[PDB]
Swiss-Prot record, chains A, B:
Binding site for Mg(2+): 156, 158, 237
Sites where the protein binds Mn(2+): 156, 158, 237
Associated pathway: Isoprenoid biosynthesis; isopentenyl diphosphate biosynthesis via DXP pathway; isopentenyl diphosphate from 1-deoxy-D-xylulose 5-phosphate: step 1/6
One record GO biological process: isopentenyl diphosphate biosynthetic process, methylerythritol 4-phosphate pathway involved in terpenoid biosynthetic process
Keyword Transit peptide among UniProt keywords: yes
Cofactors demanded by this protein: Mg(2+); Mn(2+)
Reaction(s) catalysed by this chain's protein: 2-C-methyl-D-erythritol 4-phosphate + NADP(+) = 1-deoxy-D-xylulose 5-phosphate + NADPH + H(+)
Name used for this protein in its record: 1-deoxy-D-xylulose 5-phosphate reductoisomerase, apicoplastic
Residue window of the full protein shown: 76 to 486 of 488
Keywords: Apicoplast, Isoprene biosynthesis, Magnesium, Manganese, Metal-binding, NADP, Oxidoreductase, Plastid, Transit peptide
Amino acid sequence: KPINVAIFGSTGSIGTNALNIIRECNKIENVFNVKALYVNKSVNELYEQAREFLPEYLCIHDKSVYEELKELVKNIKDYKPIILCGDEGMKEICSSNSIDKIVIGIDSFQGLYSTMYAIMNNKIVALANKESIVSAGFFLKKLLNIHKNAKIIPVDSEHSAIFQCLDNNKVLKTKCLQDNFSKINNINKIFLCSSGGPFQNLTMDELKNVTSENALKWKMGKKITIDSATMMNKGLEVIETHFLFDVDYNDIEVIVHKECIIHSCVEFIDKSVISQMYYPDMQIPILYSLTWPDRIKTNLKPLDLAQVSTLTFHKPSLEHFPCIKLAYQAGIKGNFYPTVLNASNEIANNLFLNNKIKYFDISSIISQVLESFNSQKVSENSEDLMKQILQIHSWAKDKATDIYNKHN
Amino acid sequence: KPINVAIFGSTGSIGTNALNIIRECNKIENVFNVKALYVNKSVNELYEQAREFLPEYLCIHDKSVYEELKELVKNIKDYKPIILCGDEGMKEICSSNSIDKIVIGIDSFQGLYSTMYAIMNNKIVALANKESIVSAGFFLKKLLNIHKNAKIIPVDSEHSAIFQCLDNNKVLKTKCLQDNFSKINNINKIFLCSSGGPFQNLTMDELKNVTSENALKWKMGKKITIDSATMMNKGLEVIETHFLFDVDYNDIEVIVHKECIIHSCVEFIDKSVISQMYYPDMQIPILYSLTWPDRIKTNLKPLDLAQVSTLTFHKPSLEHFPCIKLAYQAGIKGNFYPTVLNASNEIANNLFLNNKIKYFDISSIISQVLESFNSQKVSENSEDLMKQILQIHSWAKDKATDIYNKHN
Ligand SMILES: NC(=O)C1=CN([C@@H]2O[C@H](COP(=O)(O)OP(=O)(O)OC[C@H]3O[C@@H](n4cnc5c(N)ncnc54)[C@H](OP(=O)(O)O)[C@@H]3O)[C@@H](O)[C@H]2O)C=CC1
Ligand SMILES: NC(=O)C1=CN([C@@H]2O[C@H](COP(=O)(O)OP(=O)(O)OC[C@H]3O[C@@H](n4cnc5c(N)ncnc54)[C@H](OP(=O)(O)O)[C@@H]3O)[C@@H](O)[C@H]2O)C=CC1
Ligand SMILES: Cc1ccc(CCCN(O)C(=O)CC[C@@H](c2ccccc2)P(=O)(O)O)cc1
Ligand SMILES: Cc1ccc(CCCN(O)C(=O)CC[C@@H](c2ccccc2)P(=O)(O)O)cc1
Ligand SMILES: [Ca+2]
Ligand SMILES: [Ca+2]
Ligand SMILES: [Ca+2]
Ligand SMILES: [Mn+2]
Ligand SMILES: [Mn+2]
């Protein structure tokens, strides 16, 4: 009866939100068993989680805090977890028959490795890490075609919204990333909603001057805050939409909805549009990823639409947010351009965060790396294709850094 | 896999809209066969439709234009339709094995009769007539339990919206007008959107003196236009929601949404809200009733959310729109109070339309009729129950009229 879940990246924003909603859902019935928690190096925070949830498995990626973990955990009475470390630990958890569903709340390109292994073990993968899809979309499709019982269920709020708007009667006959998913689901077009970020109303002159402090001062982590400010977050999410739902780029429309109530919309072939809405929230997306195709009761505050009162929609200016255009261009180009987009953005975003370049330099760097990249034949076997993605990702990060280094 | 459809009330608003969307859809691919048309007295319109759609059956209710119809139809080359008459024509159409779905576009209290025979013959019934559901909900539920393969599919725009927000793998485990429909679909709450009609900004003093002219001068029939002005249309729709979807009255919220883009919204038990949105429209509601659980291509204009730009929501004032409160009160009392509400409103609406009473007299009369009713032993026998509904309807109409005449 209980859904057996692993939380990968349990100490971060997604991971802690997941454990919060699991905690609430488990107050009376045993709805979920938390079988495994995996983090990078937050050994103290992991220990506190282990004390509460008592998972069968604990894993730390950073082997240097393994002893520290082992020692902390001995303090917990009558608890004999399997304590693992690194890639080998990740792979052992993914292999466990006692795990059904894995929440991937690991950030950056790193989250791809666990995603890949979770699919290879025919698990349900509740994927929040959009960089994996953007970097490796075609590769994940291939894997999902081999590993017949694996599924990716989207957790990113807009993709969760789109997924929810679908009719599960059609969803159940396909799965995310599968060729023909949009046909089977009668999808015509997607309205991909965005907050628009902190700089949405600035003039071109004002935008030239913006700093990371101006973006940082809805409270989110730094990387995503900067991506929201440039709208590269939405750019990545366009490519994410295309891969998840097999929707053509020309049928994905970015819409700025600053109230952030409507989380995205699907237009079906009859032109009817379905949308999903709630307060800005990750608990519903995470919960749904674990309960789908069912829903369960929560005690979340009900949406008060009369109090919200007003919902607004407008088209983003691609002159002001050129990251959006770069994302569409890379996605349409296909091949490894999305990998290059993501990698170069990782560098450009961090340069801006750290006050080393200007706002328009972010898109300039990314553009230059994209223009520099030469298309490669797509390796035909899975393990060569993975190595290739890694090659290009690293190449693009280095190229971005080289561009920055040369031009100051 | 052609969809075989009969249109009942084919020359009316619903009927003609149904043929319109069938016509447009069939231009894209021939999915619909119109097998039967049925009208009251519009023999010439009927002839013209018969010319286009070449239905196997034709039926007119009023015996006195039967021969005229037979005459008219002779003109049509290479066409030998079965031409039928009255209550008896309807019964034969509903019994045909070549008809899968019947659109009931017959208005007022009348529409119940053909609904019943459509259900008795295990058809899919596309039902727009909210008054039948409000007045005879308990009878329809009983019929639908006897006739296991019959289904009512809602066409009323808000109810179609609600229905379209659901997962059909769960819908297919139940059917509308069944107990536990909302439980099985994990429905928590409904937002029932309303235009708000022409009087939302009027003061109490202004409402005291509004006339039917002010109500009438979005173009619809007179009766529904007056109901939209008083918001008794929404009150009837609250009860319609309760019966169609088994949603408790305290879990239906009327919200004024004057732009009429979001057609209504379903809050699930996790507090996720899904909504259906389009331009104000009856084509998609009708078409979906006929395609459910699938959708097909249309050439309808795509919603341009950016252009719509702004969507607003507010709570209706019950002091200004007391008909809403009366509908909830009747719904919550249950029994035959909905039958009484509907019947007395039929009279009060017509009184106001004909300048015989004032705006607040509408709710006054309805209130007084409801107060004079006493709950009745609900017959377990289908035949006795229909007679109860007819008797109570007629009683309530006479009572409303008596209250009008006494004060006037
Ligand atoms: N937060 C949100 O609301 C949203 C998140 N997302 C996406 O979800 C992903 C995760 O985001 P978020 O929760 O914000 O990220 P955080 O930075 O808050 O958390 C990252 C988590 O991953 C762990 N981690 C990092 N590297 C490894 C590794 N090698 N092995 C195991 N665990 C590791 C961290 O461990 P430690 O604590 O030890 O560092 C931490 O638990 C991102 O791709 C993000 O874009 C998208 C939509 C919304
Ligand atoms: N369309 C809309 O926007 C909305 C409609 N509705 C509901 O839909 C229902 C239908 O409304 P609408 O189509 O606008 O109404 P109309 O008055 O425009 O249509 C009436 C139709 O019923 C036919 N009819 C009447 N009596 C008989 C009979 N005894 N036998 C056969 N046919 C008969 C009429 O035939 P004839 O032409 O010969 O008189 C005509 O075809 C209403 O109950 C309303 O509440 C709900 C919400 C909005
Ligand atoms: C504290 C908190 C909690 C939950 C959420 C849910 C939105 C999460 N999400 O999917 C994201 O991609 C974040 C970035 C995007 C966004 C979306 C909504 C609000 C603000 C920003 P955008 O790229 O549109 O600017 C947000 C903020
Ligand atoms: C010609 C045409 C065609 C389609 C529509 C769309 C839906 C109509 N519908 O279901 C009704 O109940 C009508 C009355 C209600 C309404 C709803 C939307 C717009 C305007 C009015 P309300 O009770 O909320 O005032 C409208 C007008
Ligand atoms: Ca150490
Ligand atoms: Ca759904
Ligand atoms: Ca297309
Ligand atoms: Mn997102
Ligand atoms: Mn309606």
